[PDB]
């Protein structure tokens, strides 16, 4: 019985920490979701310069390349 | 009352667990791809400025 | 109760391990470039023509 009271009280502070933790995590995921939208643009441009480098390399190798 | 609170804790745990794991897996894989994209991007621009230095 | 707790918590930690593991495989190369660009960071600009 007294042990149970102690356990219930510790469980109460536990549950409060649980809810606070998860609320912060909700904010975390929400933040990342909003961020995500501001990343696809950059990703596209990254792949654009990537394939640019790839294709220009292939063509330079085709012509008189001037590498090492 | 006692087990009602036990399962209240469990339901909160599992609920937010599913949420957190969704967050975790999806955004982690996404950001890993984003990271490698930014890697190649910055490296290309770095070499661009390197060649500019040699142009000087 | 405890069964759901241990199973779910174990899965949670497993997915966290997966998260960090893939992040190791996909981000571990950054410090090299970070050190590089830290060495490159010496910037100062005064437009003489302006």
């Amino acid at each position: 019985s007294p042990h149970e009271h102690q356990q219930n009280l510790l469980l109460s502070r536990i549950i409060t920490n649980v809810e606070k933790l998860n609320e912060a995590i909700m904010v975390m995921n929400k933040t990342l979701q909003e961020i995500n939208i501001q990343n696809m643009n950059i990703e596209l441009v990254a792949q654009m310069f990537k394939n640019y480098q790839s294709n220009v390399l292939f063509h330079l190798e085709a012509t008189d390349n001037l590498k090492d | 009352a006692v087990k009602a609170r036990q399962l209240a804790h469990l339901h909160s745990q599992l609920t937010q667990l599913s949420h957190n794991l969704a967050t975790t897996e999806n955004l982690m894989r996404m950001t890993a791809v984003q990271a490698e994209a930014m890697r190649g991007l910055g490296s290309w621009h770095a070499g661009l400025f390197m060649a500019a230095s040699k142009v000087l | 109760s405890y069964a759901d707790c241990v199973c779910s918590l174990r899965t949670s930690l497993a997915f966290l391990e997966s998260s960090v593991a893939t992040l190791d495989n996909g981000v571990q190369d950054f410090p090299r470039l970070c050190h590089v660009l830290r060495t490159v960071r010496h910037y100062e600009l005064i437009p003489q023509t302006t």
Binding site: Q53, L60, K67 | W44, G47, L48 | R32, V36
Partner: peptide, 18 residues
């Protein structure tokens, strides 16, 4: 562009020094 490619390959090289 040529030297930029060379520099990029050097940048992504796991080994590099100042």
């Amino acid at each position: 562009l040529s030297q930029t490619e060379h520099n990029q390959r050097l940048i992504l090289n796991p080994e590099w020094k100042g």
